[PDB]
Point group: D2
Chain length 509, copies 4
């Protein structure tokens, strides 16, 4: 395919999906995916990062989830060629409006009827007496920020309401969109100024527990401005300074102030459904393409979250439209896809992981790599910093000497990230001794991390050759290349080296 | 935007949708959209082609629907600068087997009788299926366009023969979604749209566009993305089904489909589409193709506001559209069927010249060009002092549209 | 040849010069080429412009030369398909330092001996008494501009001298380079500021005679600055306002101030030998490539003059090095080559014209056209002037629909020149009714002018079709194309049209 | 200069010749240039290779010439930063018939005995002529480079086989000028130089360069143009004959040949030479070629002051030069024959490391790199804070030069 149009006209749907998957998979662990035996099966089927939603459960609960994730992860360590690192991600509650419990016995489900009437109250007598008439919620200051004629959304926006009359505690609304109101659901107020903090007293505890439990990354919720990110940084502090902060863009202020949030964060998560409420639905696809685009250019990773395969909560296979939606998010240029209820609580957590792999595998057929790189090279600011210079040449060479891989010997990952910024077709095999580095690597597109566990041989160049040989074995075993192919190898020069400034064209023996 | 990535990083969601819409809109007429007053409002809000689903209703029923469509369409004819052609499309029942059922043979003959512009032929499996539809339409309906619908696996596998036999293609995503693995349909769509762009035949995306607007006044986030990605994939038209046929908000469905298709043009990166299509084009020295290329080429350089094509059958205007200019292609035609059929192509804006013919050839030409100049000015496409490209024949009755002319807007 | 290097590696010296010649030939008429029968044979063999050197001869003499040129030219008019226009060029004397006559009877030749002594004097007693001791010359102010240790050159620089002592009239010099000093020869003063005017009392007469005789172009000598060109323009004045001024660059000031001279002139002539004296020899080749380059970009024509085939004054065939020198001047991007003594006075004027055609024919094999055009298009300032827009598209189309020609219907030539600026491979057939336009066309590279003599039909489009058909006949007859080929045709739209804004792809009937 | 035409329109003749000379200079030693004191002055002024014409003189005569060349050459060795290698070239009599006359067999064996770097083999007609010269030089002189001289028509016709058999080519313009039509020789020259650039073997231009300097201290305008166009054509070295061998101004001939070749580099447009040579290169994934490409590619981007190649045989430094970087190629070698032979290639600046080997491989490497850094700084090629590219092997005894390293100048 010398042209993008010819790359589309070749697309044969009957020939098998030969290209391997190249984007991270993030699964939300919960009730249906929390056992060691399941986690094992999800790790095999492609889970790369375990997401823990601290909107629910106690610290005790999550500690066990984390312990199970690692138990399952390390079950495969007895073969260091096929062992895959799995990361752990702490996802903050944030500023969150939630409803109360549904009243009485039986099913926790009231049918909110289209056009009907609904009183929103702050009277804690109704705290667990939610029904068709009255609805409690936890935002105490709600009557000050919200006005007459304002929209209110409930349960990832399934239900919508319009404020008809205000009060001290009561707010009288008319139910515009119907649905089944469940217990304790999430409540958005588009174009309200929610006076809640960036880091609640709870979030401060949850983040300290994150540091304690040695998490790899924080998914910081309802990020509105740069100073919100810096408050998350401070709480993680000195001890958790190498934990990656992914800011979640969930509202309008988020999108408007995006550039400052990106420059302050380690990466970005685009919550499409939350935006879909706070912004006009017809415009979210541009928001997604803009944010993913800017992140590709800045070389920070970006995740697509919400509304991926939600039909697999109840079904063993997704819809046509969900498959298209996910795939276009991969082509847009996302680094990872994130499953939520699909894996957390759904009836088919294992099949959700396998389809997310299937879809992300197919999308790579549609990706036209040479354009992504040439554009990213031309927009790159012309530094003669040796590492960036070498990363470019490595990718450039990866297309020419038809390369099967780019092998990066990297301690912190930084070098492997600088190569990935430029979007090579070839897999980037990041060889690291630091296991956190190996775990964090999954956030980047096309990095395949491996963990070298033999400790260091005195002779520098031998240590290097041993690690390269490890990556050669892994690659051969993964099908990435076979004897007679050629790979690129980035290293330092000498053992104290500041730069990864050494490019080396190596035939696979 | 010198790069495609920089074209995405510029995308400001707060600034209004300044670029005008460039892809056809096809609406399915039925119970909720069948009155003249509604049709009127849908035509204003952007309907370009009326689709009649002959899976349901009697011939008598549809005859009235068609008559209402035309009544509404012609309400605007009293201003020939702002009059917009509206097309009629007959959509077969199909096998539910042979390619043309005893019913379909009747329905197609009724199509010819009613002077439809295009047939959406269902469950097209192979090339010989298309040719059977052609034969039934026969001599009298020989200028009716056949859009083959790809609805099953055999359809996708044998696509190249179906495309080479058809006037255009419709990709029914939901039908494929059943017959094919769900995870693969998006590739099918990108392949089929791709091949059609290259062959220069039009392609339509149908089913599962804004189906939530059957009951709701606004679509979902995911529907909006789905439609928009179909436009970027490179579709020429989008087709609404239940949204407009029977739903509670037929008029708002048309307006959103316009809104979405308007926003998608911001995301389109035009210079790449053209340069790729030029490089893949087989080096003919057929004068019309040679001129169509140069016209598009010039449309980028002399920052052109339009390409005006004087075309009787449309063929010339289609050859320009194959090459995907950013500029609007104003197809000026005296044939009203040509003006109606034009909507199938992306970025063709057809206009209908009703002034009769002046004896002096070059005067007739200048009068038509001046008509397009007026329409363009009035539509905001360009203003005085801009430059447009003008394709014409050379001499009367000419076989080629082989005359390119760089004209300042007066 | 997709690359320029592959265009060189293809160059087969055994296969004949298949490509037709595409650059103008200018011959200097004089003693050996002044008869009608010779001029006839030179016109057949390829002369396109007759050059008359007004450094010598009276007005009466030249009037006859001009009359002979036209007699010979029009001999071929009895077939308007094969008739070729021939232009006439008046070449000014300029500010000129010259020596006196050699003393006495007999041989007009004194042997200036290497290292010897030579007095330069202004005493008109010695005006026709030049010898080994004393040498008269015509520059009265020579003692003011020249200093002790200064170089002085004589007779196209064959002889060189160094100033040892100054005086009022006398200047005592030491003869550095030897040779045979003849009568009245040319005397350069490198890095002197020669205080002479731009248009001498003589040049004013010669230019008025030019207008009188209906010349097509003036080759203005010793052009130093823009204001010198404008003085030549004023003298030619209203009546001779369509006579083209070619400025000759002959000295250092010329090269330094080139951009203003080019912007003021209709075209440029690069006198390599004259520069070779005023400038360091090793730098002239860069000057030539710069000046030719700038002229190609400005779209004004440029001529290479002096030191082409000078060995053919005495010999029937040139040297290897002369052939290379000429050919590289064509590849540099010159529009015309100019022969001097070779044709003016030499023993083989006819063979000099035929070799100059042979060489210029071979050079077109080495020319790589697609690069010239693509570069010239990218550097062209993005006007939306309809004529430039159409000229570009015409050339663009000339490569694609493998075109045999670009036919331009042009009254003044301007349209045909705008096409030629962009360097198509295809011949540009300029069809004009103005015979001066047809003559002046030869200054441009790749314009093949033809003169339509059928008078005008009232119907515009018929007139147009008749002219197009004339060019079709000429092209067929010249071998440029045959039936079934495709050509491009530029015209106006309507008879009052300002622009040549109509491009038309026409199969050859 | 983004375009070649803009590279010509910039050419300022008043600003000094800032770019350094980049093509080898070969001088013919003889009566007027045979003394140690002269040779010294020619080496300073830029002689890179001494040519000995075995058409005349006895073996005894030449032995002394060679001994004088080396005496003069090594006078500068007392500063290994500024020491420049000088090569010796044996130029056969040839047939004046078989390819190797009984004389030539003796002269070539004497060449091997005297440790010459290259043979200029005369009147080469076909490939089998080259192989006979190879056999005579044999095992002991197997690393002596054979430059075939093209002097006649058979030579030009059969050129491709001669090039594929030879180490390099010499184009004798005057000899061709007799055997071929004068008007065609310039094409022959451009063809042969072109093919040699593409094959990556070196090519020399000989005869009719500055012949007027036999008697005069300065050349003609036309000689200067002739030489300069030979450099732009793409020659690697220029060769002076009588100018330096017997003429009255041998030293000034060398200085002008430097002056001209210095000016020609202003006119050279490098980015085109490289991109063309890369696109025509057969896409091997042999690690050395892969790295040579990337090195040149990087040399334009990280605006590099040099490409430093640690090379034992030169082969690596030659593979970089094939691709025509603007940057100087500093070939660092311990083999003095390698350093001498390097001058045949365009843009290689060889240096001779005389410090012996440190046991630690990477230290040895760093010491050589540091030597080239010192040389470059001292030659003005770059200063502290610039960035250079460094090619090396990976372990000791490595077969590939497969290690590219972007290094700031300390
Ligand atoms: N980062 C993920 C996905 C991935 C990137 N590149 C790959 C190459 C092969 C397989 C998977 C991948 C992983 O390591 O699994
Ligand atoms: N064919 C459609 C869409 C379209 C094409 N080109 C356009 C230019 C402007 C506006 C709309 C269009 C129409 O005429 O409406
Ligand atoms: N104008 C010149 C040179 C020329 C340009 N294009 C040509 C094509 C053919 C012959 C000559 C030419 C001539 O007529 O002689
Ligand atoms: N090879 C020659 C010419 C040369 C190539 N690159 C150079 C850089 C600088 C000076 C000279 C050169 C030398 O070393 O002298
Ligand atoms: K959360
Ligand atoms: K149907
Ligand atoms: K003169
Ligand atoms: K010899």
């Amino acid at each position: 395919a010398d042209t993008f149009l010819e790359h589309m006209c070749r697309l044969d749907i009957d020939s098998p999906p030969i290209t391997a998957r190249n984007t991270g998979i993030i699964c939300t662990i919960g009730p249906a995916s929390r056992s060691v035996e399941t986690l094992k099966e999800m790790i095999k089927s492609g889970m790369n990062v375990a997401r823990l939603n601290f909107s629910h459960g106690t610290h005790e609960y999550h500690a066990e989830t984390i312990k199970n994730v690692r138990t399952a992860t390390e079950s495969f360590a007895s073969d260091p060629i096929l062992y895959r690192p799995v990361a752990v991600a702490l996802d903050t509650k944030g500023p969150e409006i939630r409803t109360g419990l549904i009243k009485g016995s039986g099913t926790a489900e009231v049918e909110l009827k289209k056009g009907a009437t609904l009183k929103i109250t702050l009277d804690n007598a109704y705290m667990e007496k939610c029904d068709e008439n009255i609805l409690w919620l936890d935002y105490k200051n709600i009557c000050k920020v919200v006005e007459v004629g304002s929209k209110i959304y409930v349960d990832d926006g399934l239900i919508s309401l319009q404020v008809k009359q205000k009060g001290a505690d009561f707010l009288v609304t008319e139910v515009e969109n119907g649905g089944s109101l469940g217990s304790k659901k999430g409540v958005n107020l588009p174009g309200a100024a929610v006076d809640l903090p960036a880091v609640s007293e709870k979030d401060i505890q949850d983040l300290k527990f994150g540091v304690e439990q040695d998490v790899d990354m924080v998914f910081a919720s309802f990020i509105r401005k740069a100073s919100d990110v810096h408050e998350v940084r401070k709480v993680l502090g000195e001890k958790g300074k190498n934990i990656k902060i992914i800011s979640k863009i969930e509202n309008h202020e988020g999108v408007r102030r995006f550039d400052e949030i990106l420059e302050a964060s380690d990466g970005i998560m685009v919550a499409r459904g939350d935006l879909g409420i706070e912004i006009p639905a017809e415009k979210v696809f541009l928001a997604q393409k803009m944010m993913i685009g800017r992140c590709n250019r800045a070389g920070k990773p970006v995740i697509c979250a919400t509304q991926m395969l939600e039909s697999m909560i109840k079904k063993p296979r997704p819809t046509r439209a969900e498959g298209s939606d996910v795939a276009n998010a991969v082509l847009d240029g996302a680094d990872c896809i994130m499953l939520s209820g699909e894996t957390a609580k759904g009836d088919y957590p294992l099949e959700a992981v396998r389809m997310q792999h299937l879809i992300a595998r197919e999308a790579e057929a549609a990706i036209y790599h040479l354009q992504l790189f040439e554009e990213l090279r031309r927009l790159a600011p012309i530094t003669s910093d040796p590492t960036e210079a070498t990363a470019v040449g490595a990718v450039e060479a990866s297309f020419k000497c038809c390369s099967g891989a780019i092998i990066v010997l990297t301690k912190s990952g930084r070098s492997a990230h600088q190569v990935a910024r430029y979007r090579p077709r070839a897999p980037i095999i990041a060889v690291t001794r630091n296991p956190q580095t190996a775990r964090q690597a999954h956030l980047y597109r096309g990095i395949f991390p491996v963990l070298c566990k033999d400790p260091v041989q005195e002779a520098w160049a031998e240590d290097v050759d041993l690690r390269v040989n490890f990556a050669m074995n892994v690659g051969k075993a993964r099908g990435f290349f076979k004897k007679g192919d050629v790979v690129i190898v980035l290293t330092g020069w000498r053992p104290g080296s500041g730069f990864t400034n050494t490019m080396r064209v190596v035939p696979v023996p």
